[PDB]
């Protein structure tokens with residue numbers, strides 16, 4: 001009876017196994033745009049993905065992860081609200097059963113169809129497993145997805161999905177360039193928060209881009225054909241793998257822009 005996304009083992013149950021679920025800096029949150037504070041001293045985000053080495057794509061039973069070689073500073077995030085340097089380890093998405101839901105963060109209560117998380121760890125901690133045990137261990141770049149015109153840089157991911165339909169499957173996934181998933185603007189909101197799935201650790205500097213990307217209905221439909229189950233088990237479509245917004249508590253969301 002492990003955690004997941006249902007009646008029986010979804011977000012409202014997680015706190016029994018992972019009591020920080022009710023902690024002081026949980027994610028995601030609703031981004032009230034009018035109340036976010038413009039901070040003129042926030043720096044532009046530096047996204048340096050040119051040397052990124054994707055390796056593999058994995059269905060982990062909760063989402064799919066596109067993995068990168070994080071054994072050197074290739075793709076890194078810095079600047080923005082951060083100190084030092086954060087290495088890209090993986091990206092994944094959260095999405096809905098319907099275009100009207102799927103994102104984890106919300107913007108003035110608006111839900112997007114999906115949300116991309118580019119996950120980076122602070123090189124001062126040496127590796128990801130140590131970093132998650134630190135309050136400044138991770139920087140997650142969140143990017144909203146709306147349904148409209150296709151994102152051509154996404155198709156390379158969508159098309160491999162049938163090879164990883166079920167939980168535990170992986171496929172080689174080299175030469176994927178995550179720059180093709182970015183919107184034009186790097187304007188952002190930022191706040192201190194947590195992992196949005198168990199173990200829910202309070203180790204994340206969240207950086208959420210204001211500009212969504214557009215993906216097509218057909219692209220997101222392919223996400224919804226993935227399965228939470230393993231091969232040879234009853235089919236449970238991988239949909240609605242998002243955590244709802246959590247109490248903001250004693251936090252201020254900062255905006256890089258006005």
Ligand SMILES: NS(=O)(=O)c1c(F)c(F)c(S(=O)(=O)CCO)c(F)c1F
Pocket residue numbers: 117119132140194195196197198199200
């Ligand atoms: N959605 S999110 O970006 O916050 C995110 C991560 F990026 C992430 F790497 C993990 S994890 O702790 O690696 C494994 C979960 O059991 C997470 F748990 C997790 F929630």
Ligand SMILES: [Zn+2]
Pocket residue numbers: 092093094117196
């Ligand atoms: Zn995520």
